[PDB]
Enzyme design. Structure first.
Site, PDB file in Angstrom:
ATOM      1  N   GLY A   1       0.830  -1.214   0.000  1.00 48.22           N
ATOM      2  CA  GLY A   1       0.000   0.000   0.000  1.00 48.22           C
ATOM      3  C   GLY A   1       0.858   1.254   0.000  1.00 48.22           C
ATOM      4  O   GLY A   1       1.872   1.309  -0.688  1.00 48.22           O
TER       5      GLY A   1
ATOM      6  N   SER B   1       5.136  -5.811  -2.324  1.00 49.96           N
ATOM      7  CA  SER B   1       5.457  -4.376  -2.343  1.00 49.96           C
ATOM      8  C   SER B   1       5.924  -3.890  -0.955  1.00 49.96           C
ATOM      9  O   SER B   1       6.884  -4.426  -0.404  1.00 49.96           O
ATOM     10  CB  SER B   1       4.263  -3.563  -2.877  1.00 49.96           C
ATOM     11  N   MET B   2       5.237  -2.900  -0.369  1.00 49.39           N
ATOM     12  CA  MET B   2       5.593  -2.398   0.978  1.00 49.39           C
ATOM     13  C   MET B   2       5.517  -3.454   2.099  1.00 49.39           C
ATOM     14  O   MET B   2       6.229  -3.337   3.116  1.00 49.39           O
ATOM     15  CB  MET B   2       4.779  -1.145   1.331  1.00 49.39           C
TER      16      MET B   2
ATOM     17  N   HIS C   1       8.457  -5.185  -6.512  1.00 51.80           N
ATOM     18  CA  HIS C   1       8.303  -4.418  -7.759  1.00 51.80           C
ATOM     19  C   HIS C   1       8.580  -2.940  -7.529  1.00 51.80           C
ATOM     20  O   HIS C   1       8.895  -2.536  -6.408  1.00 51.80           O
ATOM     21  CB  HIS C   1       6.942  -4.671  -8.448  1.00 51.80           C
TER      22      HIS C   1
ATOM     23  N   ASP D   1       6.924  -6.922 -11.866  1.00 53.82           N
ATOM     24  CA  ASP D   1       6.482  -7.839 -10.807  1.00 53.82           C
ATOM     25  C   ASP D   1       7.397  -9.070 -10.739  1.00 53.82           C
ATOM     26  O   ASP D   1       7.575  -9.779 -11.741  1.00 53.82           O
ATOM     27  CB  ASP D   1       5.041  -8.294 -11.064  1.00 53.82           C
TER      28      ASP D   1
END
Lengths: 191, 191, 190, 191, 187, 191, 191, 181, 193, 190
Positions: B63, B92-93, B117, B166
């Site tokens: 997010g 991600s995060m 990514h 990705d």
């Protein structure tokens, strides 16, 4: 899992705090959303209550906010200056617009950011609709609001109003080190 | 005596029961609301005991980068070691936070996935405004890659190449990459 | 409207929602689609029950149309990770990731009630964008299907090849058919 | 005014119940809405709780339901048969579709309707979209589901599968007396 | 801890719950399944507390679902205690049916309260055979309502049929004369 | 968004107050929204409760409001005047339209603004639709409402009706110092 | 938005009341919204509760209302008349349509308005759609309703039915003094 | 009469017995093409007609209105795939005069099974399933006849989306020749 | 070969038939599409005959200021006198165009209404962006008032005061104000064209 | 989808829509609400017919619920300004501004068909904003009403005072009542 509860047991039995209320006991206030009237009403009430409990002890205001309403921001700003205890400000994640204004508003020597926190400064935003005369009134009001913000930022940072005007013409993103150099905070908090 | 009502989900919920044992359960996207809650839990747990480990379970598609950094910086700031455990997916995060756990104490379960990514965003308006937003996102990517490099032992150049698109990793691949230290196998249940 | 149970203890009355009341007896109720929120809750309950007692059995009731594969795997790995045996009991329907979790219960302790249904099929997803982005997404879902089929093979005794053929389209199974397949161990007779 | 609270004062304090939780204390379960997975979860949980409290005392299941999901209906159906206590069923207002199936599922001799309650039976409903072979699979499933429902209904009412098939081809509304004649209930509850 | 006391709704002890302590049930909305299930539950609870003492049902309702209304109606008849009915404001459709359903001698309206009677409403969509089944069902439901009103008022089925063909508004006094209530409560 | 709780421990009990209810215990009322009938109903009730607790001690009304309904504002206005205690008024952030009317309604000598709080005055807003005769009735009504408002403001500020009419023709923004000079407040509270 | 709470030490422990339930201890009822069936249900319930507490002591009904449903208004009206206590009425802000009808419905000599409160009278509003015979039924009903309202208003004010009909043909706004002269209230409460 | 590109360009090609299909097949499109086929036969019952096909397909019944009209009329209908002939598009491409079915070198053909829906009672779902299965059987049988492939092979090859190059469509028997510049 | 005749299009419409007689019919809001058509008609009519008068009927609530100026400047630019005749209403930019007609040749019918007021607009964004938008609309108002002053004979000071809010004028008041030259009455039907 | 009529002319075949064919015989059809667009068309037709022949009568059929007062006045003034007489014929309904235009026909040449309806009432409008703005809008609509009543008084022979009273609420008139009122001169017999 949004807002967990903490239970304490005393001679009066169990008592329940949401996590933010638990930290409020230790004089910590979290500003973690967009700034509107409801948010300012809450923060103001927490500040007043904390002063009532102890007028000498520091208060800690954590700030992770994209800003919001200027007048709501000023209700918080003025309450902070009004009360007796020092209000430490600590930026985590992001302080943008009115959020960065409140970060700069902490007690001198007691304004902080964590190493990877981001600070953004820019000019106020608004709207105007109607007759030429009505647009004029609204433009004058937002221009005077910008002047007022810049004047206060100048006092808090040591920068000139001329420099503040130039640096806030467009979105201006600062690192924690740059925010210190600018005079928006006093120290970057080391691990 | 007064006893607090107990529930699975909202009162004393299942997550609050784990918090008593210094466990934090991340099972959602990272937004400012989730980050402010996790930050508050981290500060609470340190205040309760500055020496004992904390356990952060991570199942997240990621997010907000700034919300993620609020959690990241709080973890580094506090005294206790924060163990991270990937269950399901850390993307991600979420994967950035997994990699940020105490060195030697970053784990995944055998079928958990890790995805890395580049950061995503948007910009609209004048050419000059698009430039400011592009520069900002590119600098945010540089900051993230620098920290991942420090925490994995992989070069910045390699991180940049491996995050262009990705990039899905198994638990074992995540260990080899240096995102985690150990894959927790069911065979060692009883150690 | 989730009902409340109030229990008398030696130090006062405690209110529970019906699910926390059953949690006291080491029962976990899965009665929805599987997503990250539901997985967070089920995992949290499993960790809580392990912390209460590492030896006593856990009872997981499953009525689920499935949902997120990653969310399912958070639950699956947690079940395998904890010390207590987790019994699984299908009521109503265990479909897709629901049936995967049903098969993940402790060996000899996977059950279905007589009229409960099971369905197995291949994973579903989507991809939008450049040819290169579509390729990354296709390879990922294909790898995910191999992982699911490999584990199913180990838990059922069916070959990977048979699992692939049987999951190509929606495959509905009765409780007896699920037992024959190796997805459950016994049909629980009243 | 939707769901009132009742207060009981005990030796060791005051306890507050919503009206439904108060009846549950007397082994009464209210099925008063459409049947879905969430309703089924709550009904199954209540039945399981009640058996654990007392394995021999009767349970009373009031039914005012338009029905709903067949599989959710079967979760309730199978739980009722599985537990040791007799589950009495009492139709108030309406039992249609899966609601009328559950009404017939009560303990033999202990299935009731109030004199003006309405009972409706009909064939299952559903849908199918996609390729010809996908439509075939979905059609085969609903037809097999109808066979399963009819077979159990036969067992529970004493009517042939042939009769149930014909009588459920279209919406079939029954009076409390007609439901008794059909074998869906045992007695019409007289004032 | 003590539950908080409020006018209207954590969980709370609202004004309606405080009246329920004195065996009073307040109907002030449309009758749907949720309202009916709550009223049924209240009636069963009050009978369990005391099977001898009267119950008071205040009615201000535009009506609603016929089956939801019959869930209430049958529970009232089923329980041992007398249920007094008191119309305040308006009792329309299934509301006027429930008003008429109170204990004999104990059905009331306040002087300026209104009562409305009319035929059931519904819908039907699909094949000709499906419209027929739906039509036969609503006509049977009307027959059932008219027969019960006949027993409860002392009016013939023929007269009820005629009087309910269109919307029929009655004053409190007209409702007493019709036999829907027993008395108009004078101040 | 959650409102924090403060737990006050007494001799033989614990009181869990939301922050606003905790301030009300100290005779503080927070007006932090648009003024409508519901807000007016709550404020009036708080004023009546405080009078009943102590008829002699001052009450404190903080105002951060964009105003709203004139009639709802008058419900509050008349209650302030009716009750025995002095109601101090304190503008924080903004007091606009009916909010600035209530600010001026405080006990004489006890009307305040913080240094950066904004005050706006303007004429009443409304609407009218239908027949010519109906539009006439609505126009006359809003014109009589403006006359009532201006006459009261004249009494409260010491400015003539003629001056108020001119100064409220268009949106008129005032600083705290300007609000003092105008007679809307008595003092700017310095830190 | 959020209703404030009063907490008091009682024989059963610490007892929390919303601000309105606290006022109910002083026999005060606050009407501060449009009149519909739910509002009527609540107000009637409060009136019945207060009579059960004490059948002799006066009740105080504060009215700030734009009106609403005529039938809901009559549920309140008839309850006021039915119960033994005198019910005092006090207009604050606005009493329009059914609101002004309820204001005039208070105990003789105990009907009040504060100096700046407004009263408005007009004819009932409604709608009709469908067949000519259906429109006829609806028209006859609303005409009969107006006759009922005017007859009662004539009795309560001392004005002729003929004068009420004329004065309510269109929206008719009245000051507090005008409402007194009219017979809608008995006194204007001066501060 | 005034003339535009979009008396249009299609009207000009119709004078030379060319019919352009460059959209989805629905009842409106079918009605137009059927009408064009009947008009061309009325002008001359022996001369060749040319049907260019760039279509993602559409309604099976609409497609069958066109298919049956092609077979009914006396002139040969040449078919020429440009861009893409998918589903009912590929069915009509295969339906051209034997030896006179063409594709351009970079044109694509896709074959798959028919798509549909069903909602309501179990009995209604059954009727709809039996209907679409019969429809598939009818399509596959005709495709078998026109390509030379077995019904068994068509069934397997159309279970999922099956994309073919122009050369592959020729080898399959859906077309006779890939056109050279 | 003959063109089909219609009242209004979905062909030679009623407005096209009046255009043959050098009559232009404005009966809508003024946007760019209307403006481009009216400008085009004026240029066409001048090309047909540079001497003969044009007749512009105006029933308009006004609209875009720039669109209105496209019309205004074209009127002033061309050789022929453009007569303006207000029917129904001429408001804002509509009243501006009415005033723009050939001196001596600006008319209203007796029950027509003329409304004058200040320009309306909008602004959103940064404080600097709002300032630009405000300055632009104020200069636009000054420009409109300057031209109205020249065309009516009223001072800039008077027009500013008179346009602060909606100002409704009868046909006779519009004449007195200098927005038109004559109220065209039925009595002069036969004696005057 | 207006029908077409084709006529032989002095140099060729010409197609007309039904309305432009009627316009040849000096007939204008109003069969809608009155707005600026409708007024632009009606005014244009009237100017066209005056230019064709300044002496011959025009026939305006009216079936209209009314609409814009100013758009109505554009039509009204054009009628009074042009040289030829405009006959008015009410068919169906003439309500509000429609009944005003009906009354506006040449005196002696205002008609209704036997079952046609006429309705008269006061102007409708609205205003939003500041008290001062609502005042301007209220003064404007009141002045507009006085203007309409003054002209109606002239056209009908009724006093302004009677018209004010009779237009306070919706007032429906039969064709015979409209004649008696002075809104028309004759009810046309079949």
């Amino acid at each position: 899992n949004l807002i967990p509860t903490v239970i304490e047991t005393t001679n009066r039995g169990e008592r329940a705090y949401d996590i933010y209320s638990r930290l409020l006991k230790d004089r910590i206030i979290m500003l973690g959303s967009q700034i509107d009237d409801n948010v300012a009403n809450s923060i103001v009430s927490q500040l007043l209550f904390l002063q009532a409990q102890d007028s000498e002890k520091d208060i800690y205001l954590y700030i992770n906010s994209p800003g919001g309403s200027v007048t709501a921001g000023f209700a918080i700003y003025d309450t902070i200056q009004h009360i007796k205890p020092d209000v430490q400000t600590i930026c985590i994640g992001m302080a943008a617009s009115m959020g960065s204004f409140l970060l700069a508003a902490g007690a001198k020597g007691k304004r902080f950011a964590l190493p990877n926190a981001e600070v953004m400064i820019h000019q106020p935003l608004g709207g105007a609709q109607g007759q030429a005369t009505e647009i004029e009134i609204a433009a004058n009001h937002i221009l005077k609001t910008r002047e007022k913000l810049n004047r206060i930022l100048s006092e808090r940072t040591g920068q000139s109003i001329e420099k503040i005007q130039k640096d806030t013409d467009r979105d201006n993103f600062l690192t924690a080190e740059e925010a210190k150099e600018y005079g928006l905070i006093d120290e970057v908090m080391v691990p």
